[PDB]
RNA sequence: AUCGAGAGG
DNA sequence: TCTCGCTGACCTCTCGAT
């Protein structure tokens with residue numbers, strides 16, 4: 001389908017194991033996958049989220065939402081700071097961030113803001129932290145706390161359909177609806193989730 | 207971002223059948239995943255021993271009665287289906303029951319075998335009413351998993367539906383655990399009810415091994 | 428050949444007595460759609476801005492946000508042009524988590540206002556009729572199958 | 587009287603209990619009434635009719 | 637086959 | 646105009662007696 005959307009199917013699974021394997025993998029991908037994403041941002045123009053800047057097409061909520069949409073990879077830093085200063089006429093693009101060695105952007109063409117008047121401009125610094133899963137900004141509690149999506153998965157879904165092998169009719173087939181943000185290959189994300197789940201129960205394997 | 211590994215910290219035996227298993231060092235969100243996966247695997251794929259065939263000398267078919275026995279042959283077959291045994295030697299074994307005189311016929315009356323261990327010799331199979339009557343049956347016990355009906359693949363042998371799985375009930379609860387100064391960790395407490403055939407720790411090991419064997423397919427490309 | 432071309436259940440979308448669709452979600456599916464699209468005051472996850480329906484689904488599955496939470500989501504919708512081409516429109520709309528999740532099965536070419544309400548039987552009937560009028564036969568049958576699946580699933584989840 | 591009998595058995599008086607989905611382990615969002623109803627099998631078996 | 641008595645949808 | 650015959654009022658299963 002895409003470099004971020006993939007399909008994997010396991011047909012010969014025993015009865016009742018589809019809702020075990022798929023559910024476990026879905027939970028691990030949703031809540032346990034490690035990753036780094038934007039969690040904080042400070043804007044000179046706007047002191048608070050409620051306050052609205054002048055000279056930029058997108059409101060503060062849209063800016064925070066685009067920051068949430070940003071997918072970033074950090075090499076060896078737990079918390080890193082990325083700064084963006086933009087001037088002229090045109091949309092504010094993720095490629096405008098000053099390049100850093102430890103920080104990489106999978107999709108440079110990610111719009112954060114749209115510039116309306118050349119008189120106004122924004123200089124913004126974003127904080128990126130490595131974590132696991134999705135923690136809302138409300139639970140985290142002029143610093144703008146934005147939601148952080150550490151887990152690379154964008155959507156995970158599984159569906160169990162009966163598949164019949166010769167002489168056996170109760171066997172189950174599992175198909176995976178897997179969507180990623182482009183940080184890692186969705187197949188490799190499935191591999192990571194399976195590895196994590198296997199390593200969790202290593203203390204019980206005979 | 208290293209993940210903690212759960213450990214078997216306590217296996218409590220409330221009774222011969224009722225047991226509680228605790229898994230203390232679990233991360234947040236892993237308790238429910240492990241509990242559900244282990245509960246499903248324990249309720250589905252635990253092997254056990256159940257009665258498959260019963261041969262009575264004076265009985266030709268299930269829908270008959272034997273003189274001196276208060277219970278019908280069908281009821282005797284149901285009572286033999288409700289029999290829990292353990293075999294260490296091989297899967298297939300033959301048990302012979304013989305008793306005479308007035309009095310209930312219990313699971314202790316089966317002839318003693320070194321391999322076969324009857325966990326509950328108290329429950330009755332049939333009753334003998336008058337002294338002259340006698341009962342003589344050959345019981346076949348096999349090892350398997352799940353429910354295999356007698357309909358799915360001589361005169362005088364009585365096929366019995368095999369409820370192989372020894373697990374009766376599974377309940378799991380996730381509670382907070384205090385490891386070092388961390389409070390985000392939680393513990394998984396698995397509650398088991400069985401027929402006495404399987405060891406709860408062995409049940410946990412078997413379930414985890416099945417889960418890992420299934421997961422290795424996803425681990426590989 | 429005549430069975431396939433005339434008597435197939437896929438060719439029987441509309442009633443012969445009147446142009447209303449004859450296949451319609453009912454019972455469990457209607458209850459599921461009505462549970463998804465209904466809203467509640469002070470539900471868990473209220474007031475959070477979402478980047479799309481997929482984030483709403485993620486918060487629902489994670490247990491972070493309720494299905495009736497009144498949130499603000501970015502929805503991209505398509506409307507047919509004069510020549511019939513599809514042009515997208517992106518905006519932030521006041522909706523709920525359930526409606527955002529439901530929007531994923533709605534085919535391209537329909538307004539978001541169809542799902543931005545508590546969906547009864549009449550609402551789903553009108554939505555199916557609109558889908559048939561705008562898109563055609565095969566999109567209508569695919570949409571009906573998806574609606575039935577979603578309604579069954581979320582009626583089961585509703586308890 | 588039904589509520590009192592439920593009380594004596596250490597059961598909720600509303601007649602509804604919290605159920606968990608077997609396939610996922612996720613609690614159902616609303617309480618579900620659970621009890622014992624006398625079910626009958628009618629002489630309308632499918633094998634006699636197929 | 638037909639009739640009578642039921643039953644289900 | 647009003648009596649006065651003549652007309653009309655889906656599918657499936659089980660049983661026994663002629």
Ligand SMILES: [N]C1=NC(=O)[N-]2=C([N]1)N([C]1O[C]([C]OP([O])(=O)OP([O])(=O)OP([O])([O])=O)[C]([O])[C]1[O])[C]=[C]2
Pocket residue numbers: 645655
């Ligand atoms: N031609 C003709 N003559 C009849 O005398 N009957 C017919 N058909 N049916 C058929 O069977 C449906 C109702 O049966 P029922 O028992 O399901 O009642 P119901 O209200 O629909 O549901 P429920 O029983 O759950 O209350 C009905 O449409 C029809 O096709 C039943 C009687």
